[PDB]
């Protein structure tokens, strides 16, 4: 408000699942897609930095393009009945029609120019 | 010509191996040792930041303690011929017997105070 709903498609769109055993590093794709005629800068943020790694974490997705984001979980001791309270977030933003790059753009970005989307987390097995 | 050779112990010592298929993220551990009575600060760097991830990429190893560093390689088209020219750099420096944090310490650490060691990278299968 007046916040523009997310332009990017996500897949999955609501939650990211992880298949154990969580003996080793477990990984899962998030696919982002750009259905517009402008490039869309993105950031992929996480609730537990020390626990996850995102590749790519940021970037510009060309117009009409899709990229696969690797979300990677570090090994740990599962706990079956536990609930996963990690959230993953995608911040997007059209790389301004005249943009020089994607440097200090983020800090000076308005709340209007920003498009957010949060995803839940689930463990498995 | 100064100063010190790496305090820590690396395992593997020389060369990180990665086993295919590289259709998906590939992880190999580095296990860092701290044989000493003083906390060692580390920073694990690599050549291909958008190609690798390092959990943990920085931090402190308690005195006499070990850390297994997850080093994760992103999916890609693999040749069998192609060689790997990727280098993994672990930086280290004692956390002074009286220090208070590790914020600016890196940007004001000397070159002889600093501690480096380079690891080859190898792709398999």
From Swiss-Prot, chains A, B:
| Consequence of changing residue 43 to L | Does not affect interaction with the conventional FFAT motif of OSBPL1A. Impairs the interactions of the MSP domain with the phosphorylated FFAT motif of STARD3
Topology relative to the lipid bilayer, per the entry, is: Single-pass type IV membrane protein
Where is this chain primarily localised?
endoplasmic reticulum
Question: Superkingdom of this entry's organism?
Answer: Eukaryota
- Protein's UniProt keywords contain Isomerase: no
**Might you report a single GO cellular component term?**
cytoplasm
Record note on domains: The MSP domain binds the FFAT motif of many proteins.
Involvement in disorder: Amyotrophic lateral sclerosis 8: A neurodegenerative disorder affecting upper motor neurons in the brain and lower motor neurons in the brain stem and spinal cord, resulting in fatal paralysis. Sensory abnormalities are absent. The pathologic hallmarks of the disease include pallor of the corticospinal tract due to loss of motor neurons, presence of ubiquitin-positive inclusions within surviving motor neurons, and deposition of pathologic aggregates. The etiology of amyotrophic lateral sclerosis is likely to be multifactorial, involving both genetic and environmental factors. Spinal muscular atrophy, proximal, adult, autosomal dominant: A form of spinal muscular atrophy, a neuromuscular disorder characterized by degeneration of the anterior horn cells of the spinal cord, leading to symmetrical muscle weakness and atrophy. SMAPAD is characterized by proximal muscle weakness that begins in the lower limbs and then progresses to upper limbs, onset in late adulthood (after third decade) and a benign course. Most of the patients remain ambulatory 10 to 40 years after clinical onset.
Its subunit composition reads: Homodimer, and heterodimer with VAPA. Interacts with VAMP1 and VAMP2. Interacts (via MSP domain) with ZFYVE27. Interacts with RMDN3. Interacts with KIF5A in a ZFYVE27-dependent manner. Interacts (via MSP domain) with STARD3 (via phospho-FFAT motif). Interacts with STARD3NL (via FFAT motif). Interacts with CERT1. Interacts with PLEKHA3 and SACM1L to form a ternary complex. Interacts with VPS13A (via FFAT motif).
Write the protein's name: Vesicle-associated membrane protein-associated protein B/C
Organism equals Homo sapiens
Lineage of the organism: Eukaryota, Metazoa, Chordata, Craniata, Vertebrata
Portion of the parent chain present = 1 to 125 of 243
